[PDB]
Design a protein around this ligand. Structure first.
Ligand SMILES: Nc1ncnc2c1ncn2[C@@H]1O[C@H](COP(=O)(O)OP(=O)(O)CP(=O)(O)O)[C@@H](O)[C@H]1O
Length: 331
């Protein structure tokens, strides 16, 4: 019935994180290619692990169809591993891009932040706080549009006006209200976007973790002299330390406030969401599979899954993973 590992060819290793090894794969007997995230079950032990995997799967399902999120093809498992077969996104990522470009013109940062805003707003309308926005979690597709990735840290199930309390995120991007221990909502995503926009336009972060948190909480953010009034305003508005006054966070009008901000005046949001706006940069894409923009650290790895150690695998609590199988109800 459900797909399994033996329905795919492994083509290349393309990435690694703390939970997953990511490969380019191809559905046998077809030309259809996917990314495949492989998570060893021996890494899923705590409630934090279980929730991470469950959340990633549930958000992957919500993300299918939306242009700026990564779609889910299928989930399946072997005795030792969990597998997510997902949209293959091969334009690189914004961290990669910033390492090469160093600093983006305001028009470029506008384009990326507009698409990220549309992605965030869709997640928020579905009750999801993203909580993991950072340069290397914004992928570029082959044409140069953005896709948000890495969904395990999301909070899902937030009815409008709900808040949550978990201390999490990447330190450089964690919002003041999280650092203050307040319950929070979607405001933390708009703070992170502020930080990311600062990084794009200034070429540096606006800021030990202890000292970094103190800087986030107390230090005044200075806008580079060379940025326009509109950029200064959009950055200071997103980086307001009070979530009640922050851009995008005003009740009822938040997203309209972003769309109406002078920084975004030259944005046709309807065309933007239909991918009818020309990206300002076209990623390098060559050859049969366009592996140009992945670190050779991974594309040089041998294309294989590490052999199972029976002494470990026999101890896995397989009941924890019943029902993992999934196939996209759109094929
Ligand atoms: N849909 C996709 N298409 C192409 N490459 C992808 C991809 N999803 C992930 N990758 C690559 O794999 C790398 C690791 O994936 P990811 O960061 O999601 O790992 P992870 O699930 O272990 C969570 P984390 O990295 O935050 O610890 C990414 O940095 C990216 O380069």
């Amino acid at each position: 019935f459900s797909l399994g590992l033996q329905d795919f060819d492994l083509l290349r290793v393309i990435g690694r994180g703390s939970y997953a090894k990511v490969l380019l794969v191809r559905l046998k007997k077809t030309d259809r290619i996917y990314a495949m995230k492989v998570v060893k079950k021996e890494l899923v032990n705590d409630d934090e692990d279980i929730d991470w995997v469950q959340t990633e799967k549930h958000v992957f399902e919500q993300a299918s169809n939306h242009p700026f999120l990564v779609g889910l093809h299928s989930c399946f498992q072997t005795e030792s591993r969990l597998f997510f077969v997902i949209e293959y996104v091969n334009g690189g990522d914004l961290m990669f891009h910033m390492q090469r470009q160093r600093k983006l013109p305001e028009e470029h940062a506008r384009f990326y932040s507009a698409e990220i805003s549309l992605a965030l707003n869709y997640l928020h309308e579905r009750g999801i706080i993203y909580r993991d926005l950072k340069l290397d979690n914004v992928l570029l597709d082959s044409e140069g549009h953005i896709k948000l990735t890495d969904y395990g840290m999301c909070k899902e199930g937030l009815r409008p006006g709900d808040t949550t309390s978990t201390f999490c995120g990447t330190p450089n991007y964690i919002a003041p209200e999280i650092l203050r221990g307040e319950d929070y909502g979607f405001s933390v995503d708009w703070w992170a976007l502020g930080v990311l926009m600062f990084e794009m336009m200034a070429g540096r972060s606006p800021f030990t973790e202890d000292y970094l948190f103190q800087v986030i909480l107390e230090k005044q953010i200075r806008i580079p002299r060379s940025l326009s009034v509109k950029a200064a305003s959009v950055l200071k508005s997103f980086l307001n330390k009070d979530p009640k006054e922050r851009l995008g966070c005003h009740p009822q009008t938040g997203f309209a406030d972003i769309q109406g901000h002078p920084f975004f005046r030259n944005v046709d949001w309807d065309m933007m969401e239909q991918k009818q706006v020309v990206p300002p940069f076209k990623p390098n894409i060559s050859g049969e599979f366009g592996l140009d923009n992945f670190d050779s650290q991974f594309t040089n790895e041998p294309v294989q899954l590490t052999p199972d150690d029976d002494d470990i695998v026999r101890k896995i609590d397989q009941s924890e993973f019943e029902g993992f199988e999934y196939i996209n109800p759109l094929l």
